[PDB]
From a paper:
Our model protein for comparing methods of RT structure determination is the coelomic hemoglobin from the marine annelid Amphitrite ornata. DHP exhibits four activities common to heme proteins, peroxidase, peroxy­gen­ase, oxidase and oxygenase, with each activity employing an Fe(IV)-oxo (ferryl) intermediate. In this study, structures of a multifunctional globin, dehaloperoxidase B (DHP-B), obtained using several methods of room-temperature crystallographic structure determination are described and compared.
In this structure, the heme iron is pentacoordinate in both protomers, with no evidence of a distal water or dioxygen ligand. There is no electron density to indicate a hemichrome species in protomer A in this case. A water molecule has been modelled in the distal pocket of protomer B. Due to its position, this density could also arise from the alternate swung-in conformer of His55, particularly since a water molecule at this position would not be stabilized by hydrogen bonding to any protein residue or heme propionate. In our SLX data, difference density indicates a weak area of positive electron density suggesting a dual conformation of His55 (data not shown). The observation of conformational change of His55 in the ‘swung-out’ position, in contrast to its ‘swung-in’ conformation in the damage-free structures (SFX and NX), implies another site-specific radiation-damage effect. A major advantage of the Laue method is that far fewer (181) crystals were required for the Laue approach than for the other microcrystal-based approaches, with the drawback of more challenging data processing. SLX is particularly valuable where limited numbers of microcrystals are available, requiring far fewer crystals than are needed for either SSX or SFX.
Numbering used by the authors: 1 to 137
The structure:
Amino acid sequence: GFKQDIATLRGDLRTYAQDIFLAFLNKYPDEKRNFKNYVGKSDQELKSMAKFGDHTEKVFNLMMEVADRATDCVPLASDASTLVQMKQHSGLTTGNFEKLFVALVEYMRASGQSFDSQSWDRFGKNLVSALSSAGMK
């Protein structure tokens, strides 16, 4: 289930983090605007960029902790506030996070693994609720 998926992803996180985030940037090209340094590069070129690997993994490092700390796929208000108040998230809307979890759930459904895809969809919807409650537009 959801808690087991956190262990599955964590066991190969750098791989999952890159593949999921690449699926996100490819499904939603306009999101590369928030990552100007990724425009005009293929997946393999991004996977060889140091900042891409490190940052994408750090994103998923924290995302798994937010998911780990959640109760019934509802994240703690503190994690939501942390995400909203980060300097690097100033200028991001709920739609940004909304699209990341669309790509995440679609990636899980297409992986053919036993991910609890419905729980991650809920987790993303609830995280968006918490992000809006914490002050994100």
